[PDB]
Design a protein around this ligand. Structure first.
Ligand code: U1H
Length: 330
């Protein structure tokens, strides 16, 4: 079997992407943030503290004839940006783009942090990292991908994120019309539960490519590109007037500047991020200082190839017994 679903940026900056997901019987459609950096499927629900809900579509388990309460199970997650949520757990039928899994753990939020409340366009997250990171206690639960794997034509999913435009998540097949040239595959380490891989280096603009190993994760749930301080300094040094601002919390640049492209290595292949992708617009309404899409990972502790990088490529998440990541230009 296969599935295919359109994913859409939530705003004009591509801060995040939402994908419609059908939950329950009859279907309740929620728009979820597909996150290859976490492993919980959680949703706003009828159980969420009413004051913490501000426009989200809620899942109502009592209206689903296939919903079952998972007795005594709870969940609690904290994300790298300080966001968090927690609640209880149902199992229910979940379908993405025609691909249906029965008995999927659907984590119902009782409490959400304010950053989720204020994001009225995101109804929940669908985690696509490895199941070892799932937070359900006392019995850990499997991701949607893990539950679907045996039914898929091929144990893969692909991310084709658009720049200021819709894109596609496909499950179970590789659309050979969606990319150019060939797919370069690279090894994945699952030791921390992430889609973790090693980039072979980088270049700024038309500068010389620097061969150097950058260990990082492929994370559709993170907006920006977080790289070592040395690399980020080399990039922003080429932007007249750019500087690191403590009050803003990262590199900012004069909005009138043209940004250079950023190249990262996948084995011997090169993926080029156009400079326009790195512009995240004015830091506040009306400001002539703009926020940069490449930032230092020094405070984060891990390098993150977020949407800025992934949307420049066609990305294959190969969940074979030895997992790999594939990148192609598009
Ligand atoms: N990386 C997971 C994640 C995704 C979205 C959000 C936000 F922005 F919706 F709060 C927080 C954390």
């Amino acid at each position: 079997s296969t599935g295919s679903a359109t994913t859409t940026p939530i705003d004009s900056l591509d801060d995040a992407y939402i994908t419609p997901v059908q939950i329950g019987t009859p279907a309740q459609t929620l728009n979820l943030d597909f996150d290859t950096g976490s492993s919980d499927l959680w949703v706003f629900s009828s159980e969420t503290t009413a004051s913490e809900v501000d426009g989200q579509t809620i899942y109502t388990p009592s209206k689903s004839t296939t919903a079952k309460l998972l007795s005594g199970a709870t969940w609690s997650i904290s994300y790298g940006d300080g966001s968090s949520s927690s609640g209880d757990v149902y199992t229910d039928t979940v379908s993405v783009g025609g691909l249906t899994v029965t008995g999927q753990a659907v984590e119902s939020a009782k409490k959400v942090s304010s950053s989720f409340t204020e994001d009225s366009t995101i109804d929940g997250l669908l985690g696509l990292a490895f199941s070892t990171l799932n937070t359900v206690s006392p019995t850990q639960q499997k991701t949607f991908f893990d539950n679907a794997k045996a039914s898929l034509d091929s144990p893969v999913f692909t991310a084709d994120l658009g720049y200021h435009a819709p894109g596609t998540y496909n499950f179970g097949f590789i659309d050979t019309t969606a990319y150019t040239g060939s797919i370069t595959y690279t090894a994945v380490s699952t030791k921390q539960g992430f889609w973790e891989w090693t980039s072979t280096g980088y270049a700024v603009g038309s500068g010389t490519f620097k061969s150097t190993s950058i260990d990082g994760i492929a994370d559709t749930g993170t907006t920006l590109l977080y790289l070592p301080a040395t690399v980020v300094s080399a990039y922003w040094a080429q932007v007249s007037g750019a500087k690191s601002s403590s009050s803003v919390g990262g590199y900012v640049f004069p909005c009138s500047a043209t940004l250079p492209s950023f190249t990262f290595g996948v084995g011997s292949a090169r993926i080029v991020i156009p400079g326009d992708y790195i512009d995240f617009g004015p830091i506040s309404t009306g400001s002539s200082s703009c926020f940069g899409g490449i930032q230092s990972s020094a405070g984060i502790g891990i390098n993150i190839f977020g949407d800025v990088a992934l949307k420049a490529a066609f990305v294959v998440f190969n969940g074979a017994t030895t997992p790999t990541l594939g990148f192609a230009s598009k």
